[PDB]
Amino acid sequence: NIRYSVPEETDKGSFVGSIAKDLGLETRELMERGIRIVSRGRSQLFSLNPRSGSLVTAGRIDREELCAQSTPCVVSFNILMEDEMKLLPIEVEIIDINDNTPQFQLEELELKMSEITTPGTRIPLPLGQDLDVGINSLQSYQLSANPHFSLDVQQGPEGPQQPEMVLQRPLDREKDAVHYLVLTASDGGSPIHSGTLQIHVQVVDVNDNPPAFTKAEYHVSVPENVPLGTRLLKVNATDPDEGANGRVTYSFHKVDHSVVRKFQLDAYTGELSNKEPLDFEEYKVYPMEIQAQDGAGLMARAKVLVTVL
Template identity: 40%
Template sequence: MVQETTSDRTMRRQVLLFFSVLCLSYVLGQVSYSIPEEMTKGSVVGNIANDLGLDLKRLKSGKARVYTGASVEYIGLNKERGVLLIKERIDREALCGETTPCALHFQLILENPMELFRVTVEITDINDNTPSFTNAEKRFEISESAVIGSKFILEKAIDSDIGNNGLQQYSLTPTDNFVLKLENQADGSKKVEMVLQKPLDREKQEYISLLLTAVDGGEPQMSGTMQIFVNVLDANDNAPTFAKPLYRAKILENSPKGTSVTTVSASDKDIGSNREVSYLISTSKRVLSELFKINSKTGEIILIGELDYEKAKNYQMDIEAVDSGGLSDSTKVIVDVIDINDNNPHINIVSKSESILEDSPPNTVIAMLSVNDPDSENNGEVECNIDGNIPFKIQTTLNGFYTLVTEVALDRELASQ
């Protein structure tokens, strides 16, 4: 008869698992920081050890690490100092675009025992972008018979910064014949128009040069300019007028190229060539020219690119109608992208263990999972299930995170793995 040693008995009481988790309990907590964009690599974000009440020895023994899922790890952990450091350059505009507030969300994971802490780092804007115009100049041909109050649509400036650092105001010089008019729009931008305040006289001045300046509110203040040239012509009494100030359309995100989005329509009371209207999409947002085009004669807007609801839920564009005399009007078109179920749920194993003692109590944690689906509403809702006939169950811990725990007492003699 072979004598069983203490070591043999210990090994006999362990249950081998197909996935690994190094600890059997977890603690949830969270901490938040706020930093400006464009901090240099190695800059300190915060002392997370102090803020979470963790000992530096615990960070080392628990093999502390930052978990970002599939995202870029912009911020790393220095376990020796217990601080979070900038790991990659953070450009708020590239990371979040116009979305505010802009924040990075990740987790700090420790093992033995398992602990998970949620970390949120808000990225604040700095004035690192200059207001700019897509085109360096704009040319008009305007009849000398244009009536006082005639409006001419100007291009909007682009400034990727937000808040006070973003675009604040415009100015137009000189103001002998034209003044600037700004009109607030539903999306928060301003409609920029040049309004005739003094009659033109081609015999006195055939060409007029103006300068449109866009200024932000940052420190130091930044500005961009566009040159405007007016060629004074004869005769055109009426400007085009759109049938509606706002058009709204819906389109599926998987719609093929060539799909008709909507059709805009403007009319002109003039006769002959002066009533002929041409349509164009304003180039204030470069992405629009990659996704949509408009038939200059009919006003039909056509999809020419690929849509992705997960990247943009809607697009807003300014459509101009210009007649042969240079008079113009504009309308707003909002295109809502309809989500389809085109993304599979993603399952990531955050932490796992290789073995468990058979005398472990029920609800012992053996794995921690992260599950997400980029789709929206019902398409993005996920349900986690586990195959039957095994003594485990799945529990929700917080949004997108689950734990796999024991459901009943284990018996190695009945099942060793």
């Protein structure tokens, strides 16, 4: 029984072996014995010269196409020697080369995660798959260096399995609204081939910031005979949350209504105006507690102090 080897993907006409050598035959000996390949299966991948006895490749030999994930990859055929009517079994092993990179089944993974997601939360990652075999197949995964997420991997029989992205440090949309990461999947060839997956994490807002007034206290001095409806003051509060969570409206806290009833606070603009006459007497000052509310139940406070001159 005769066994040869050849790497996949050689150029057509690449040398595989000499039948005459391995039968110990010369030129005249070889021809008189009338050798030829019996056509079957993939035998047409090889060409036998009946004068010299050389066996060469005849066409593209792709181990991935022939054998996929099976090992080893052997092409079998008979050589017929017409003289003695004897069949000679030939085996050629097709050697895997590293001509495939680990592939993901998508290019970009889009994730949405609340900024309040608890550390330890685990998300399973798309698998990398390498068409090569053995050392040339998938050997490892790598997640790009970053402060919030790390990679976890189960070390299985033939390689790594079930990659997961695990949250380590808390997210914060007010610091980073989006995170971009890269997952690579590498084989064990030399050099190593690495496939790539882009990961996009969108951080979903939580109402986790109260508004904040520009000042703890707003002082205003107003004329004794100021007309009704006069703008006295504009207050303002900012809020870093998103949408309704960061949208603030203004109002009086309900404390002493007999004071606050003399005034008007625009819920949207924060403009404070007098609604009723103000006395220089009876009340030198007029302290009032005000409130800034966002759209989802967080609040801030300030004091307004109106002095009549």
